[PDB]
Write a protein that binds this ligand. Sequence first.
Ligand SMILES: CC(=O)N[C@H]1[C@H]([C@H](O)[C@H](O)CO)O[C@@](O[C@H](CO)[C@@H](O)[C@@H]2O[C@@](O[C@H]3[C@@H](O)[C@@H](CO)O[C@@H](O[C@H]4[C@H](O)[C@@H](O)[C@H](O)O[C@@H]4CO)[C@@H]3O)(C(=O)O)C[C@H](O)[C@H]2NC(C)=O)(C(=O)O)C[C@@H]1O
Ligand SMILES: CC(=O)N[C@H]1[C@H]([C@H](O)[C@H](O)CO)O[C@@](O[C@H](CO)[C@@H](O)[C@@H]2O[C@@](O[C@@H]3[C@@H](O)[C@H](O)O[C@H](CO)[C@@H]3O)(C(=O)O)C[C@H](O)[C@H]2NC(C)=O)(C(=O)O)C[C@@H]1O
Ligand SMILES: CC(=O)N[C@H]1[C@H]([C@H](O)[C@H](O)CO)O[C@@](O[C@H](CO)[C@@H](O)[C@@H]2O[C@@](O)(C(=O)O)C[C@H](O)[C@H]2NC(C)=O)(C(=O)O)C[C@@H]1O
Ligand SMILES: CC(=O)N[C@H]1[C@H]([C@H](O)[C@H](O)CO)O[C@@](O[C@H](CO)[C@@H](O)[C@@H]2O[C@@](O)(C(=O)O)C[C@H](O)[C@H]2NC(C)=O)(C(=O)O)C[C@@H]1O
Ligand SMILES: [Cl-]
Ligand SMILES: [Cl-]
Ligand SMILES: [Cl-]
Ligand SMILES: [Cl-]
Ligand SMILES: [Cl-]
Lengths: 267, 247, 263, 265, 264
Amino acid sequence: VEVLEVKTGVDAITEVECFLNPEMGDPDENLRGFSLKLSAENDFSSDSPERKMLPCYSTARIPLPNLNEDLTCGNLLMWEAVTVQTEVIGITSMLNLHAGSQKVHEHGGGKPIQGSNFHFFAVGGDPLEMQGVLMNYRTKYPDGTITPKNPTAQSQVMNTDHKAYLDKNNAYPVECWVPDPSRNENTRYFGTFTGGENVPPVLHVTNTATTVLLDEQGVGPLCKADSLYVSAADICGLFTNSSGTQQWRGLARYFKIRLRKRSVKNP
Amino acid sequence: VLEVITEVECFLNPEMGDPDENLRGFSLKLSAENDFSSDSPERKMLPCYSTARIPLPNLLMWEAVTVQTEVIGITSMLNLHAGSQKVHEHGGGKPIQGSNFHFFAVGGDPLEMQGVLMNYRTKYPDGTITPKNPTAQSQVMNTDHKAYLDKNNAYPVECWVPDPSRNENTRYFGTFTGGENVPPVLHVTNTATTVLLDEQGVGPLCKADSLYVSAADICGLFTNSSGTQQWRGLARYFKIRLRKRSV
Amino acid sequence: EVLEVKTDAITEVECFLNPEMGDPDENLRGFSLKLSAENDFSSDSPERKMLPCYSTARIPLPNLNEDLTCGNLLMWEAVTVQTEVIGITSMLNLHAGSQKVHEHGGGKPIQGSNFHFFAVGGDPLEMQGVLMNYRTKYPDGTITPKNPTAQSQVMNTDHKAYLDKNNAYPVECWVPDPSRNENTRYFGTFTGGENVPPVLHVTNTATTVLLDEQGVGPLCKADSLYVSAADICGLFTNSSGTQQWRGLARYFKIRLRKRSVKN
Amino acid sequence: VEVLEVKTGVDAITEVECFLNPEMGDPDENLRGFSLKLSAENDFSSDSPERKMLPCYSTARIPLPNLNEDLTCGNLLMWEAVTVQTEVIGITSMLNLHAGSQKVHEHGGGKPIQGSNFHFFAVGGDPLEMQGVLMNYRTKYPDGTITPKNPTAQSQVMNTDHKAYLDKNNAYPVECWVPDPSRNENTRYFGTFTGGENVPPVLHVTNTATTVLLDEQGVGPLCKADSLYVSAADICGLFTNSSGTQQWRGLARYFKIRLRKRSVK
Amino acid sequence: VEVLEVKTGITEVECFLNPEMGDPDENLRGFSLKLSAENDFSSDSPERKMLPCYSTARIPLPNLNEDLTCGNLLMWEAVTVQTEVIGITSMLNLHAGSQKVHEHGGGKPIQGSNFHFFAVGGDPLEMQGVLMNYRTKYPDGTITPKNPTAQSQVMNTDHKAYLDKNNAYPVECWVPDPSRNENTRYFGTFTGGENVPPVLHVTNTATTVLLDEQGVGPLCKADSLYVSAADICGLFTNSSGTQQWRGLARYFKIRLRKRSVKNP
Ligand SMILES: CC(=O)N[C@H]1[C@H]([C@H](O)[C@H](O)CO)O[C@@](O[C@H](CO)[C@@H](O)[C@@H]2O[C@@](O[C@H]3[C@@H](O)[C@@H](CO)O[C@@H](O[C@H]4[C@H](O)[C@@H](O)[C@H](O)O[C@@H]4CO)[C@@H]3O)(C(=O)O)C[C@H](O)[C@H]2NC(C)=O)(C(=O)O)C[C@@H]1O
Ligand SMILES: CC(=O)N[C@H]1[C@H]([C@H](O)[C@H](O)CO)O[C@@](O[C@H](CO)[C@@H](O)[C@@H]2O[C@@](O[C@@H]3[C@@H](O)[C@H](O)O[C@H](CO)[C@@H]3O)(C(=O)O)C[C@H](O)[C@H]2NC(C)=O)(C(=O)O)C[C@@H]1O
Ligand SMILES: CC(=O)N[C@H]1[C@H]([C@H](O)[C@H](O)CO)O[C@@](O[C@H](CO)[C@@H](O)[C@@H]2O[C@@](O)(C(=O)O)C[C@H](O)[C@H]2NC(C)=O)(C(=O)O)C[C@@H]1O
Ligand SMILES: CC(=O)N[C@H]1[C@H]([C@H](O)[C@H](O)CO)O[C@@](O[C@H](CO)[C@@H](O)[C@@H]2O[C@@](O)(C(=O)O)C[C@H](O)[C@H]2NC(C)=O)(C(=O)O)C[C@@H]1O
Ligand SMILES: [Cl-]
Ligand SMILES: [Cl-]
Ligand SMILES: [Cl-]
Ligand SMILES: [Cl-]
Ligand SMILES: [Cl-]
C-alpha cells in the first residue's frame, strides 16, 4: 500500500496503490493462495464445510490524510475517488503445468487450472454492502466465518434479513454473499461469475485501462471518515491434483485509485 | 401523450417449482424420454414466469424512464460441497450448468405473451396456465395462444414467450442459451442502467397507477449425486426510475 | 430514378412466418424427418421431409398508381424492420422425447448446427446455389440447382434462383446472392458443429434500419413486400439416438413510407 | 506517388466484383472444394504431403478502366479502392448431414464440418506480399507448390529470407505463408485463424456490411497499372468421412469493390 | 523529466521478435521440451528447455541534441504501434508429428493454454514475480524470484525485476508490474484450459495508440526503445502423447516523433 500526493493544493490529486491478497482458505503453510481440497456429495441435511475449504472476500480500509483543520467550518473537504485501474496479478503462474497437477493423459503435461470462476472488485467510501444467498440454507458453516444468520428456505432465493457490511477480511465466504444492488450508494462494484467444469480462465492485463467511478451527476465515492475501501474476490478456477482432488486457486488484485478533494456542506 | 421523479425497487423471487419446503429455488427432478403421446410433467418440475404488480401514488401518469436490474446470489453456485455429483473420483461437486434463460420486463400493463410448445400433445398439470386447444401448429406459430402474465407462478416458461406483436407499453429483454454443458455467465454491477424510452422519448405509461415487473432466471441444472437433475433459479432485483407525464 | 419522400404517408405491416423444416407427419410440425447418415456421395437421395427449406411470403400493399404509364409514380419504401424468433423457451422442455443425458438425468437439449436468416425486400430474394455434393439426387417437390457439376460445390454462376415458392428451396442448397439483391436487405448467421449451443435473444427494443447509403430503402415493385427466413435452431435427439431438425417461426414488423420515383 | 485530391465528376467512380473459388486441393474430378484425405503422425524427418492435400491461397487480378500512366500527362489519376463488401458463399451447404459424413452415434445424423479454420481476404493495388513460416522446416513439399525456399530451423519462427508475392493462384500453401505486416503498403488484409478439433464454424452473411479500405490519411489502395488484386483463403473446417478419414472443406468468396479516381503527382 | 511541446518540422522503426519457447534441440526451434507432469510441489525441478521465457529487444536511436548544453533537449517519443503474431497458418499442418484425433483421422491441432503479450517502452519492462509453487527449483540460466516464500504464490513485493535479458525470465514466474511501468505500455491476455482453441487475428489496418491521458507516449530517455513479448500459442501433442509448447514471432512497427523536454 502506498498513498502518494501526485499534486498538492486546491486541485490536489492523491493516488492510492495497493495489492489485495486473495483469501482462498490457505490449508497449510505452503499453500497460500489455494483452498483445502473440495469435498463432494454431502447431503443438504449434513453439509458442514471445513473453514479452509471456503474462499472468502478480501477487503481493506485505507486511511487517507485529514483535510479539515477546523471541524466547525460551514463547508468541509472530502476525498472523492474518480478513477480506478485494476488487474489480477500473476496470471502467467498458471503456465506451470509441471507441478502437482494431474496429467491430461498418459505422457502428457499437467492439467491447467479451469472451471468455475468469479472475478469481482469494488471501490467505495463506505464498506461494501452485501446480501446473503445460500445454495443450501441448512449448511452448517464453520467457526471463523460470517454467514447469513437464522437462515430459512427463503434464504436460497431472497431473504431481506441477510444484510451485511464487508467489514472483516477473510471471513465472508464468497458462496454466501453478493454485493447488494439495493444499497451501495457510495461504492461502485463490478463482478462476473462463470460456472462450469471446463470453463477456461480468460484474464487481461494492461496499464492503459481505466474505470471512471463518477455517477450520473459527476460525483465519485466520497471517503467517509477519510477512509477508502477496496474489496475483491478472484477465484481463478480449480487446480486438479494427480490424485483427482481439487483446490480453488486465487490471485491478488492490484488497485490504483485517483482521488481529488471535494467541498461538501458540514452536517 | 403530452409534456413531461420517483424510484421504486423490488426483489422478485424465482418460481422454479419448489418441490418441498427445503428446496425453495429448485425444481422437482427432471423426467426424461417420455413419448410425445404420453408427456405429463408434474407441476413442481415446471419453472414459471415471475411477476409483480407494484402500486404507485395517485391528466398525469407515471412514466418509467430507466431500470437497473441484476440476478441475485450468483456466487451461491460456488458451493460445490452440497448435494452435487462428484466430477470424478476424489473431485469436487459438479457446477450448475446447462440450458439457461434470463429474462426481464418492465411495463405499464401486464406482459403480453405468445404460446409455443415443443410438443403440442403435452398434458400440462393442474395449477399451470398453458395454451388452450393446442394443435400441431402450436409447435410453430398459432395465433390463438395469447396471454397476459397476470398470475405469479402459473405460466410455465417452456410454454410462453413475450409477444413482439403486442407489448406497446412494456419493454422486455431475454436471452436463451441451450445445451447440456453451457456455462452460466452472469455479471453484477451497480453502474449499469437500461433506458426504457422509445424513439419518441416515451417510456412505459402506468395507467391505473400500476407498474409491472416480470422475470425468468433459470440458471442451469443442478446434478445430484444420484444423477438426477433439477433446475436452479435466482431472484431478480429491479430499481425503476419514474417521472410524471401529462396525457 | 428515386426522387423525394412524400409526407397518410406511413404504414406498418406485420407477419409471423412459419418455419418449413420438413414436417414428417401431422404431429411433428416444426421438425424434420429423422436424419440419415453416411450415404456415399454417389448414392445420396434425401427424402423430402428430411430437408428444411426457406420460408417466404409476399405481402400486397395498397395500389398507389391509377395509371402506370405516367411520368412519375409512388412506391412503398421499407424503412425499418423489427424481427424476432418465436418460441425459444420451448427448448426448456427436456421431459418430452429427448435422450437422457445420463442414467436418471433429464433429456438432452436441442443443440448442434443452426442457421438464422431473414430478408426484407421489394423483389423476391435472389439466391445462389452451392452444394455439399453435386451428385445429390433431390426429391420431387424441391427446387434445387439445375445441371449441377463439380463446380457447384464451389461457385457455379449458373445456379441463380428467386425465392418464389414457400417450402421448396432447401436451405442446404441455396444462399442469399451478394452479387444481386439490389432491392432486398438480408442477414444471416450459420453456426456449425455437433454440440454448438443455441443462443437466441428477444427484445422489442431493437430495430434494423433498411435504408442504403443514399437513404433509400427497398422499393416495393408491383406494390408487393417480400419477407424471407430460415431458422433452424439445432438438432433434437430422440431417446433412440435418431436426430431431427427443429425450427421456429419468425415475426416481422416493417415500417413503410411513400416515395416518389421517375418512370 | 504523392497523393493529391480525390476527383469527382463523370466516370470518376466504378465498381468491380468477383467470386474467387477456393483452392483446397481437389483430389479427384468429383471432389472440387475439398482436399485429399489428411495423413497424420508423420515424423518431422519424413513429412511429404501430397499436393492434393494442401489448401492454397486464391488470388486474381481485376482489370480497371485504363488511365494514363505517363507521369508527365495533363490528367494523371489512379483508381483508389475505397470499400469492399465480401462474404463466404455457400455456408448453408454444411447442413447436408446425409452425404458421406460419419454418424455422430448409432442411428444419428452425419457429423458436421468442424475443426480448425482460417478466413482471410485482401484487396490491394499490388499483389499481396507474404512471409513464410513453417510448422516443420524439414517438410518435403510437392511439385506444383511454391513454399519457403531453402528453409532452416529459424523458418519455424521468423526467417526474413522467406518473402514472396501471391502471384499465382492455387500454388502457395496456406500452411506455409501469412500476409507480411512489414510490407503491403498498398494492400489491406484481414484474417482470423481459429484452431482446434471441435471448433464450430461461425459465418455471417449480409449485403449491408462494408469494410472501409482508407488508411488514417483517407487514402485507399492505389491501383498500379490499373489492376486490382483480390486474395482469399476460406478453410471452413474438416469433413469427417464414415471411415474416420478427414478432408478440408473450402468455399468461394465474393468481392464487391468500390473505387474512385484520385489525383496523384 | 519535464515534458514540453512536440517538436514540429517523425520516423518509424520495426522489429520481428523471435519467441523463446525453450528450443530443446536444433530442429525444434519455436517449441519447448516435452512437458513433465505430476511432480510433487516439494520436488519440482523443471529443465530449462521446458520453460518458455519472455522475449525482448532494444532498438538504438540517434541522440537528437547537437548541442547538449541547451535549456531544452529533445527525446524520441513512441506514438503508436502496429503489431501482429507471425505464422499463425503454420498450425494448419496437421500431417507432421501430431497425434491422430481418432483412427484414420488427421493430426490434433495445437490447442490449450495460451498467452499473448506485448509491450513498448522507453525503459526495459518492469515485472513482478508470482509463482504457482514457491518451492519450485528453477534451472541454471533462468532468472526467477529470489528467496521466495509462500507469499510468493500470491503477492510478495520483494520480487521486482527488469526484463533486461532475452530468453532468461520464465513466463510462468513473471508478469508485467502495474505498480511501475510509468514509461511503458503493456497488453496481455491469458486463456487457460486443456482444449482452449487458439484464436488469432491478422490485419495491417489496426493501430494501438501509446499516448497516455496527457497525450504523452513512452519517452526514449536514453535514446533506446524497448519491445517485449510472449506468444505461447498452445500445446502441440506428439503422436506419442507427449506435449510441447509452440510459440510464434511477433512483429512491431512503432511510429516515433520528437518531443521537447527540460534539461536536467
Ligand atoms: C466424399 C468422399 O468421396 N469420401 C470418400 C473419401 C475421399 O474420396 C478421399 O478421402 C479423398 O482423399 O475416400 C474414402 O476412401 C476409403 C479409404 O480411406 C475407401 O477406399 C474405402 O476403403 C475401405 O478400405 C480401406 C480400409 O481397409 C483401410 C483400413 O485402414 O485402409 C484403406 O487403405 C489404406 C491403406 O491400408 C494404406 O496403406 C494407405 O496408406 O492408405 C489407404 C487409404 O487411402 C482401405 O482403402 C474401408 O474404408 O473399409 C474399403 C471401402 O470399400 C472403400 N469405400 C469406397 C467407397 O471406396 C475415405 O473414407 O477416405 C471413401 C469416402 O467415401
Ligand atoms: C438437493 C437435494 O436435496 N436433492 C435430493 C433430491 C431432490 O430432493 C429431488 O430430486 C427433488 O425432486 O432427491 C434425491 O432422492 C430422490 C427422492 O425423490 C430419489 O431417492 C428418488 O426417490 C424416488 O422415490 C421418492 C421418495 O423417496 C420420496 O420420499 O417421495 C417421492 C414421492 O413424493 C418419491 O416416491 C422417486 O423420486 O421416484 C424413487 C427413485 O428411485 C429415486 N431416484 C433415484 C435416481 O434414485 C435424488 O434425486 O437423488 C436425493 C437428493 O439428495
Ligand atoms: C498442491 C498440493 O499440495 N497438493 C497435495 C494435496 C493438497 O495438499 C490438499 O488436497 C489440500 O487440502 O494433498 C494431497 O494429499 C496429501 C496426502 O497425500 C495431503 O494430506 C497433503 O500431504 C502433504 O504431505 C503434502 O504436501 O502433500 C502435506 C500437506 O499439508 C497435506 N495437505 C493438507 C491440506 O494437509 C491430495 O492428493 O489431495 C497430495 C497433493 O499432492
Ligand atoms: C419426436 C418424435 O416423434 N420422435 C419419434 C421419432 C420421429 O417420429 C421420427 O424419427 C421422425 O422421422 O420416431 C422414433 O421411432 C422411429 C419411427 O420412425 C423408430 O421406431 C424407427 O422406426 C422404423 O420403422 C423406421 O425405419 O422408421 C424402424 C427403425 O428401426 C426405427 N429406428 C430406431 C432407431 O429404433 C425414433 O426413435 O426415431 C420414435 C421417436 O419417439
Ligand atoms: Cl444475516
Ligand atoms: Cl391459449
Ligand atoms: Cl439452377
Ligand atoms: Cl522463400
Ligand atoms: Cl526477486
